[PDB]
Amino acid sequence: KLDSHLKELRDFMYPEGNTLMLTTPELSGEFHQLGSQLEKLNHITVEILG
Amino acid sequence: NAEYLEAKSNALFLKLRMEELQVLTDCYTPEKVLVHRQIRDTLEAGVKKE
Amino acid sequence: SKTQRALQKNTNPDTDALLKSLSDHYSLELDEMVPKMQRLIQQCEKHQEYG
């Protein structure tokens, strides 16, 4: 039982087997994408004001 | 993080819109609008005759 | 008995309860947060076009 509990919790926390994951990978990917798109929008804005 | 990125995106969009409306106010003064009206009327009369 | 006592002291939260909480939280993030972020991405793309 102890071995099973340990294996289940570990599988959940280490989805890619090597790294403890605190954020949902799907969410982490979206944050990065949103940050990149905002940086582009800020360039276009600066360029037009200039 | 999600809230912050949302607030940043909205602020950039409003800046861009403000600057657009300021340029339009500078371009179409009452005197010019009257002239643009005269030009329209002549062009519209030409389009109709042709 | 020593091992069972050690399991009861260390059991707040119950491993099964904890796995459930973890699974619920994961579902909540996919249903609410991920779509919200996608909406924001799309809005940003529209603002670029407005530029």
- Report the C-alpha gap between C35 and C46 in whole angstroms: 17
How many angstroms separate the CA atoms of C13 and C26, rounded?
A: 18
Residues 3-42 of B with CB under 8 A from C: 5-6, 9, 12-13, 16-17
Structure tokens of A20? 């403890």
- All residues at 6 or more sequence positions from C18 whose CB lies less than 8 Å from its CB, including other chains: A9
Query: Is the Cβ pair B16, A48 closer than 8 Å?
Result: yes
Residue type, C22: L
Closest-CA residue to B5 (of C1, A33, C8) = A33
Count CB-CB contacts under 10 A for residue B9. 19
Does C44 sit within 8 Å of A38, measured CB to CB? yes
Q: What are phi and psi of A22, to 5 degrees?
A: -100, -35
Resolution of this model in Å is 33.0
Chain B residues close to C47, C-beta within 8 Å: 9, 12-13, 16
Per-residue DSSP letters for chain C? Answer: -HHHHHHHHS-SS-HHHHHHHHHHHHHHIIIIIHHHHHHHHHHHHHHHHH-
The number of angstroms, rounded, from the C-alpha of C14 to the middle of its chain's C-alpha atoms is: 18
| Rounded CA separation C19/C34 (Å) | 21
